[PDB]
Design an enzyme around this catalytic site. Sequence first.
Site, PDB file in Angstrom:
ATOM      1  N   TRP A 126      38.136  16.530  18.449  1.00 17.40           N
ATOM      2  CA  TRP A 126      38.677  15.280  17.931  1.00 17.40           C
ATOM      3  C   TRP A 126      39.618  15.595  16.774  1.00 17.40           C
ATOM      4  CZ3 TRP A 126      36.453  11.685  13.865  1.00 17.40           C
ATOM      5  CH2 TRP A 126      37.087  10.435  13.910  1.00 17.40           C
TER       6      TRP A 126
ATOM      7  N   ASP B 275      27.763  15.819  15.634  1.00 17.87           N
ATOM      8  CA  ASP B 275      28.550  14.591  15.643  1.00 17.87           C
ATOM      9  C   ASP B 275      28.177  13.829  16.911  1.00 17.87           C
ATOM     10  OD1 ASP B 275      30.361  12.551  15.598  1.00 17.87           O
ATOM     11  OD2 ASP B 275      32.115  13.794  15.203  1.00 17.87           O
TER      12      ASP B 275
ATOM     13  N   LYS C 165      30.657   2.751  19.722  1.00 18.07           N
ATOM     14  CA  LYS C 165      30.980   2.798  21.139  1.00 18.07           C
ATOM     15  C   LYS C 165      29.817   2.482  22.058  1.00 18.07           C
ATOM     16  CE  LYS C 165      34.866   5.734  20.354  1.00 18.07           C
ATOM     17  NZ  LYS C 165      34.708   5.925  18.886  1.00 18.07           N
TER      18      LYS C 165
HETATM   19  C1  LIG Z   1      33.541  13.022  18.236  1.00 17.66           C
HETATM   20  C2  LIG Z   1      33.798  11.798  17.406  1.00 17.66           C
HETATM   21  N1  LIG Z   1      33.310  11.735  16.128  1.00 17.66           N
HETATM   22  C3  LIG Z   1      33.533  10.627  15.351  1.00 17.66           C
HETATM   23  C4  LIG Z   1      34.256   9.554  15.846  1.00 17.66           C
HETATM   24  C5  LIG Z   1      34.447   8.377  14.912  1.00 17.66           C
HETATM   25  O1  LIG Z   1      34.125   7.135  15.493  1.00 17.66           O
HETATM   26  P1  LIG Z   1      34.013   5.838  14.534  1.00 17.66           P
HETATM   27  O2  LIG Z   1      34.695   6.134  13.232  1.00 17.66           O
HETATM   28  O3  LIG Z   1      34.717   4.685  15.198  1.00 17.66           O
HETATM   29  O4  LIG Z   1      32.564   5.500  14.281  1.00 17.66           O
HETATM   30  C6  LIG Z   1      34.758   9.595  17.154  1.00 17.66           C
HETATM   31  C7  LIG Z   1      35.680   8.523  17.673  1.00 17.66           C
HETATM   32  O5  LIG Z   1      36.267   7.778  16.885  1.00 17.66           O
HETATM   33  C8  LIG Z   1      34.528  10.736  17.928  1.00 17.66           C
HETATM   34  O6  LIG Z   1      34.996  10.820  19.213  1.00 17.66           O
END
Ligand SMILES: Cc1ncc(COP(=O)(O)O)c(C=O)c1O
Lengths: 398, 398
Positions: free
Chosen positions: B132, B213, B248
């Site tokens: 990411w 994560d 999500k």
């Molecule tokens: C691997 C991973 N970590 C963290 C995030 C952070 O998600 P969010 O900030 O919307 O909770 C995402 C996608 O945004 C992700 O794919």
Amino acid sequence: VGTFENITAAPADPILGLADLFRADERPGKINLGIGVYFDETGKIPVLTSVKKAEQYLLENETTKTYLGIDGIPEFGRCTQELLFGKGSALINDKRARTAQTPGGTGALRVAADFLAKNTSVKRVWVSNPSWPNHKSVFNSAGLEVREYAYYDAENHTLDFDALINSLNEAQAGDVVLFHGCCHNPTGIDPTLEQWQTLAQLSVEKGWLPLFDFAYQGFARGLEEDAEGLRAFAAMHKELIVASSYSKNFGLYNERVGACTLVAADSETVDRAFSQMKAAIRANYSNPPAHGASVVATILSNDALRAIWEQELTDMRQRIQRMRQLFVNTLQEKGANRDFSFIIKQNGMFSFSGLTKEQVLRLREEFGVYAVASGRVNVAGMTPDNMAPLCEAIVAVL
Amino acid sequence: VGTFENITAAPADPILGLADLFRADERPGKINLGIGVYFDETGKIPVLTSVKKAEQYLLENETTKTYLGIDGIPEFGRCTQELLFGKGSALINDKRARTAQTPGGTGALRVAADFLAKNTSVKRVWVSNPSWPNHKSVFNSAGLEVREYAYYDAENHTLDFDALINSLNEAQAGDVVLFHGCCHNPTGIDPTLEQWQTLAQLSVEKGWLPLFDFAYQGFARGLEEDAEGLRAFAAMHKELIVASSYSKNFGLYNERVGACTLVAADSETVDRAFSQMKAAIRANYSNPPAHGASVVATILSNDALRAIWEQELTDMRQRIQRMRQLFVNTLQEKGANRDFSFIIKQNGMFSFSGLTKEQVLRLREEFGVYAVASGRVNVAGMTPDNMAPLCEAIVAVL
Ligand SMILES: Cc1ncc(COP(=O)(O)O)c(C=O)c1O
Ligand SMILES: Cc1ncc(COP(=O)(O)O)c(C=O)c1O
């Protein structure tokens, strides 16, 4: 060998620390005058009717929770600039201001500190003495040095405008000078329009970068009256930052609703700079929480709903002025011999009572009256019912 | 001189800057396969039934918006630990874990980055290649160096476990190693349970600090099955960190619901360390937004809403797997000679299509199909209505 084995325990937050001590105390006659939240005559921390109506609207009309942009809801930003600068300000027509929706006023301050430390030559930030305790923690965490300038005259309970300017005479160009927009925390003393103008002309001369902490718009005199000091700076400076909060004037504490507004010389410079601010946000919380800001925008955008909120804010400002008057009168009835008239002349939710660290501690352990160790007392926590026990405990400690 | 005149413009976000171009394009028939949000068969981003149910319950029973604790709603952290570690994990009984509610998974990663940088000797974080994109920005914002380790076999569309092991050879003890709990972003390839165990043993021998994560728990195989990798590490390590997100698997993208969980050797140590994590939160956003996390806690602590939510999550997972099969089938019928069978074996919302940056830009400007420049395509954005135009466009650019 563990990585966490040798971590040192952090000290208790002086404000949020009292909240947990208060939550544990079992005595029934407790009185919470620490954290800056508004209580009604009943002693509850209510939700504004305008807020309950906005939430009801959002519940039935929301069809998606998809990510907001990095800078948040556009209408929220446009409405924030109108409150700060006015309906037809030049900063707006000239497209000199960009606003980002942040998680609370604290979030707006960290975003600014990260933006400044990672994209500019700034390295020193001037904060009043005294001030909100968390100001030092936020700017230090971003890597910026924090210096103190004089402000409060304890013997006279007034603003020491001479000591302030003499202190700020040591701030070099390019430094950040943090100003409370209104309802100074914890003194409740704000500069006069003339004093503001004296600092504005002195700021452009010495070359400071103004940064306005603005968490109590509408709790001094009015939404427009409380922004005069800011609008005096905005009409004179080419650059300035404004971190504002809606936690207090909307009662949206736990929803974290705030804004960080950049101002530059022209539109090409504010947009160029705002791209790095959006990047500092992306690497922090990515994008801001929608529910709280969505409520504020709904209220400000709807005339009928805005009228309800403006009245609710007026009722809050005046209930504090009633408790303020009642506080002084009741102290004299309970046998206090000191003069507490200066409390009448202080703006906002707090009052610098002049009590010592020992007296404050004694109020808590012996009477269950909770206040911050600096002697700061939440006037909005006082009600007709708890006023007499509160004053009796103060007199017993004087 | 101006403090902002010397600022350099930042590049647009490779993921969020994409949706800006999509909003501007006026070609009829645009297809958005960029940001990782879930679409339904209609092509819209819905609100879960359980979320609307919870939001209504909150609107009726909420009496105050007063501040949460620095670490958020207690029940939210309790139910978060059960999801990650198990209904009766030893980590929980021994009170070795402390969870802090954060603004989304990104906020959990930033809170951990600030915590590690200010309270430990951690100076290096190892992230997979690819990963990411915002991973490197979050840890860099705290001053932590970020190294990359091998992961993906672009030839076999599999996990290059041999290259992964060798590339992590220079990872020192006390370094942080970031693993994707499940549904690796963007490759979609996850370690097997056997490989997780192999990495767990190696991590304890090398002295790494694992940081998981979890952004897609429940999108690979299930809530419990997706946590097997973490639970293999948890059973062997004394210390680890988990940054999880509910954006999500609950459809709560813009409410910023996340959780950072510390694990230490014993209760006394994690408490001592967690107090410093609360200090890093206080210096950033003070306290987290309540609405989003309150929704999650309501659903998880109620068997009626939870059984509904779990079925909604299954429905989302099952639609994505059906679009994976349809995507490969239609590519064949539309004349693709390259074999895309590997799309089926990938878990989560994304499929690493294997297209070049040139092919991705040609899809955007020539066909209005928007995907990330790394070749990452959001299968959750495909529908029976856009599948054929989409596949026609890909075949044309192959
Ligand atoms: C691997 C991973 N970590 C963290 C995030 C952070 O998600 P969010 O900030 O919307 O909770 C995402 C996608 O945004 C992700 O794919
Ligand atoms: C002067 C000042 N700035 C900022 C804040 C933080 O506001 P918020 O709760 O919105 O983060 C406070 C009060 O909490 C404050 O008194």
